[PDB]
Amino acid sequence: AVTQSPRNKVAVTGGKVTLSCNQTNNHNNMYWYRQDTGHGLRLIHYSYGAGSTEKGDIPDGYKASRPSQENFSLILELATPSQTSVYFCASGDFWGDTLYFGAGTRLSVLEDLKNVFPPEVAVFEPSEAEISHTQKATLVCLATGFYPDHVELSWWVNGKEVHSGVCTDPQPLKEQPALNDSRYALSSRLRVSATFWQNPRNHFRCQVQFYGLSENDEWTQDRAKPVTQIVSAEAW
Amino acid sequence: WIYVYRPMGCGGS
Amino acid sequence: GPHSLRYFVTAVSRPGLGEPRYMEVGYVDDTEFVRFDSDAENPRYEPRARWMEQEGPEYWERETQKAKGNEQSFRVDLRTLLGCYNQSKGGSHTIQVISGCEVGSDGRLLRGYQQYAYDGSDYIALNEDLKTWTAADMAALITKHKWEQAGEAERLRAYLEGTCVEWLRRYLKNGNATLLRTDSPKAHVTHHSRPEDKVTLRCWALGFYPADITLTWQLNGEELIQDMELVETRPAGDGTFQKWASVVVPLGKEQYYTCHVYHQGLPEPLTLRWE
Amino acid sequence: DSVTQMQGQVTLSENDFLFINCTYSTTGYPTLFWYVQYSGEGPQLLLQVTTANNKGSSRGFEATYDKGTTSFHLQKTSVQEIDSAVYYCAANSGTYQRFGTGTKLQVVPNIQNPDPAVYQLRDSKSSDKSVCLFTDFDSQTNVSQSKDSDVYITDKCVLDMRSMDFKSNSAVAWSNKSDFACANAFNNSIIPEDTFFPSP
Amino acid sequence: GIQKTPQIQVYSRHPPENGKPNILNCYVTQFHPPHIEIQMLKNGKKIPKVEMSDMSFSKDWSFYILAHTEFTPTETDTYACRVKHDSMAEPKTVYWDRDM
């Protein structure tokens, strides 16, 4: 398998960033691609095997070390916001054979770290109207005012995590599209039969994972440090 | 036009 | 009449001092035309015939890439193989491969082939039916097993019947000139005395291309096969070729001895004599 | 060594027959691939074929190596909606692998018994904040973006009550505003003429 | 896998004439493994400036190589080729004969 470290990442313009990819397939070839709207998968660097690093289609900004057959890492020597993007590592047994890809890493780069923020989470209860009409109970969870778009929302019903009856936006809203760095928002529904929700023994929680700063980022502000965390909201 | 060799990935005697 | 395009691949570990040596060498009609050496700096696919300079810059980029990858593939096969032959880590070994296509006069695939060898002995090969492998031994069995498992035969066969054969054509058209050229051998007979009123007659043939030539010595119309010293044919480095045939003779009886040079560039076989 | 697939988005209804266009330009004898990339995930080999003219099949898709057309058209007899994803076509004769934009496939469900309605929900803690929920509408109606700058409106998304078994569409809307009411939000969308607005 | 021993020819490109420039080459063939080292000798001393055609092999699996250098025949001087290779206990050396 090919895995990527880290999976999420926030960095200030001018700083150094290393994404490492480690591969359990016994493959010579490895590639780093970047992915963004309208351009899709674009190759940056690749490696025929342990030792080499050849430039791909769009190398400027990036450097890649290939220490062994297992590791390929790329380094943004000094980051820019033009490099905010999602990154994908692939391995390949030989030249022009299938490629196996990693789960990707999300990298937001912004010049200030004061515009970071965690989510704020409230769940809203089903309408008595809907219950009456449809015999079904929808609840909404809304995550609001967070930056950057590094979240992972889930429903927890009675302490176990559910997937049926659930859906959640494909991608966050610009809470206000004017400002060039607007905080995001993101909604999701869990739907259940009416009988289920009007029973009060039942516990409903939605939980968004936020991905922000680390221990070794340093925080000046009075406002609490916006680190990778979990914000929750519940209901009965 | 050179062909791209597949890895032998052998084992044995 | 027929023609051919073969690639010769060599990998040699030079331990314990690091990276193996990777060598790829292409030959059309048994004349080198492209080469790749891991050992140069700026390792790249180079032309070795002028008619090949005719190929663009995007051709060489393409072939280098593949070469680069191939290299990496053998780099590990070399290292895998030691473990399988319970071999010591210090010494140096050799993977070699020959792969390519001979085509008939009717421009049709006549025999396709791909054979590997490890340390100068056979390891595996493709069979005439282009669908099956022959494994030289228990080690090559596992290889064969995997290569069937992954559908390798069909993918090589594509290359062998398709790509290869098409590109032999492209290379031929490109070189009808330089390749089917022909230089007739320049011949002369030297004379050296031997102790016992004996003489050595040496018939020379110089500056001929192609490389096959047959020279012969007779007296009374009979070829003197069990009497000739004769050298393997050799490159002048021109690249024309040289070859000689000599033979022992009694001092005086020389005028009864004639040399004979059959070579495709001369209309009628030469017949030579000293002095 | 190149590939061109002429569709950016494609959307359909479940059970619809799927066909996505692929032609390639190549100098050697490339092997051909379809890669699939389910949202949130990285790409994955859907299927490959190495020789013209055979066909690969996976997960009920298939594609034939069409040398005469230089084509590798991806076809599925009955598109399900798990299949909503980005589909990438690709050749390779020993080049390095590049990827276009591929085709974004949205598969939408045949909504059985449409019951359009807009419900208004209460916060479970605050008790005072509201949200608007357009729901149970039909798969063809389109939810348009908020023409007002201070009202936010999510794009459509479908959920499935598996054990039920039941699919429904939905979108929500909200705003911190003085005059915000449900009748209002979704006005800039063409809602079905029967959509049920209760009285609070 | 066993090992084949090198064959040698030492000869001049052009039919030697004293005082007139020429090339002397040494054609080594039929050997396994490919690592070989080859010395050219003038008047029994090593020559520094020796070019080597690039290595190759044959259906044999055996290798060949063709080392050469410029030189100019005199009635006096002597040339040899010395080829050290694993397949031989002791390094074989071949004297140039202008008559062959």
CATH of domain D1-108: 2.60.40.10
Task: Examine chains E and D and say if they touch (3+ CB pairs below 8 A).
Answer: no
Q: Distances from the Cα of C65 to the Cαs of A48, C38, C68, E65, in angstroms?
A: 9, 12, 5, 27
Quick check: C158 and D96 CB within 8 A? no
User: Residues near C3 by Cβ (< 8 Å), separated by ≥ 6?
Assistant: C28, C29, C102, C103, C168, C172
What are the extents of the domains in chain D? 1-108, 109-200
- Give the whole-angstrom CA distance, residue C81 versus residue C15: 14
* B-chain residues near A95 (CB < 8 A): 4
> Is the domain of C35 the same as that of C74?
yes
Q: The domain that contains C100 carries what CATH number?
A: 3.30.500.10
- Give the whole-angstrom CA distance, residue A122 versus residue A142: 6
Q: Distances from the Cα of C8 to the Cαs of A10, A94, C65, C147, E35, in angstroms?
A: 51, 19, 17, 21, 17
Task: Examine chains A and B and say if they touch (3+ CB pairs below 8 A).
Answer: yes
CATH of domain A1-111: 2.60.40.10
Quick check: C162 and D29 CB within 8 A? yes
3-state SS, residue A203: coil
Tokens representing D140 are 């063809």
3-state SS, residue D118: strand
Q: What length does chain A have? A: 236
- The domain tally of chain C equals 2
> Is the domain of C163 the same as that of C210?
no
Judged by CB atoms within 8 Å, which residues 115-134 of D form the interface with A? 115, 117, 119-126, 129-131, 133
> Is the domain of C66 the same as that of C193?
no
Dihedral class, residue C107 (left if φ above 0, else alpha if ψ from -120 to 50, else beta): left
Long-range contacts of E81-84 (CB under 8 A, 24+ apart): E81/E8, E81/E10, E81/E26, E81/E28, E81/E38, E81/E39, E81/E40, E81/E41, E82/E38, E82/E39, E82/E40, E82/E41, E83/E6, E83/E8, E83/E26, E83/E28, E83/E36, E83/E37, E83/E38, E83/E39, E84/E36, E84/E37, E84/E38, E84/E39
Domains and CATH numbers, chain E: 1-100 (2.60.40.10)
Judged by CB atoms within 8 Å, which residues 70-99 of D form the interface with C? 94-96
- Give the whole-angstrom CA distance, residue D96 versus residue C66: 9
Residues A91, A99 contacting (CB under 8 angstroms): yes
Helices C152-159 & C138-149 angle (0-180, nearest 10):
80
Q: How far is CA C144 from the centre of its chain?
A: 27
B12/A contact by beta carbon, under 8 A = no
Domain end residue (candidates: C181, C203, C230)? C181
Which experimental technique did the depositors report for determining this structure? X-ray
- Give the whole-angstrom CA distance, residue C187 versus residue C190: 10
Q: The domain that contains C210 carries what CATH number?
A: 2.60.40.10
**What is chain D's percent helix, strand, coil content, to nearest 5?**
0, 40, 55
Domain that holds residue C189: 182-274
E68/C contact by beta carbon, under 8 A = yes
Q: How many CB atoms lie within 10 A of CB C175?
A: 20
Alpha-carbon dihedral sign for residues D94, D95, D96, D102 = negative
Between A and B, how many CB-CB pairs are < 8 A? Answer: 7
User: Residues near A97 by Cβ (< 8 Å), separated by ≥ 6?
Assistant: D31
Of C136, C135, C154, C153, nearest to C144 (Cα)?
Answer: C135
Of A107, A62, A63, A61, nearest to A84 (Cα)?
Answer: A107
Q: B5 to chain A, minimum CA–CA distance in Å?
A: 8
- Give the whole-angstrom CA distance, residue E12 versus residue E14: 6
On the CB side of C123, CA atoms within 13 Å amount to 29
User: Residues near D191 by Cβ (< 8 Å), separated by ≥ 6?
Assistant: D116, D134, D137, D141
Residues E91, E44 contacting (CB under 8 angstroms): no
- Give the whole-angstrom CA distance, residue A113 versus residue A15: 12
Rounded to 5°, the CA angle A215-A219-A224 comes to 95
Quick check: B13 and C7 CB within 8 A? no
Topology of domain D109-200, CATH: Immunoglobulin-like (2.60.40)
> Is the domain of C26 the same as that of C120?
yes
Task: Examine chains A and C and say if they touch (3+ CB pairs below 8 A).
Answer: yes
Neighbours of chain B (3+ CB pairs under 8 A): A, C
- Give the whole-angstrom CA distance, residue D125 versus residue D143: 29
D51/C contact by beta carbon, under 8 A = yes
D33/A contact by beta carbon, under 8 A = yes
User: Residues near C182 by Cβ (< 8 Å), separated by ≥ 6?
Assistant: C209, C210, C264, C265
> Is the domain of C141 the same as that of C54?
yes
* A-chain residues near D164 (CB < 8 A): 193
Residue A81 DSSP label: G
Residues C144, C135 contacting (CB under 8 angstroms): yes
3-state SS, residue D181: coil
Quick check: C62 and D94 CB within 8 A? yes
User: What's the resolution in A?
Assistant: 2.9
D86: nearest CA in chain A?
A40
B1/A contact by beta carbon, under 8 A = no
CATH of domain A112-236: 2.60.40.10
User: Residues near D192 by Cβ (< 8 Å), separated by ≥ 6?
Assistant: D114, D116, D137, D138, D141
Quick check: B4 and A93 CB within 8 A? no
Domain end residue (candidates: C150, C166, C181)? C181
Domain end residue (candidates: C164, C181, C198)? C181
Residues D153, D185 contacting (CB under 8 angstroms): yes
User: Residues near A128 by Cβ (< 8 Å), separated by ≥ 6?
Assistant: none
What are the extents of the domains in chain A? 1-111, 112-236
Rounded to 5°, the CA angle D27-D29-D34 comes to 105
A98/D contact by beta carbon, under 8 A = yes
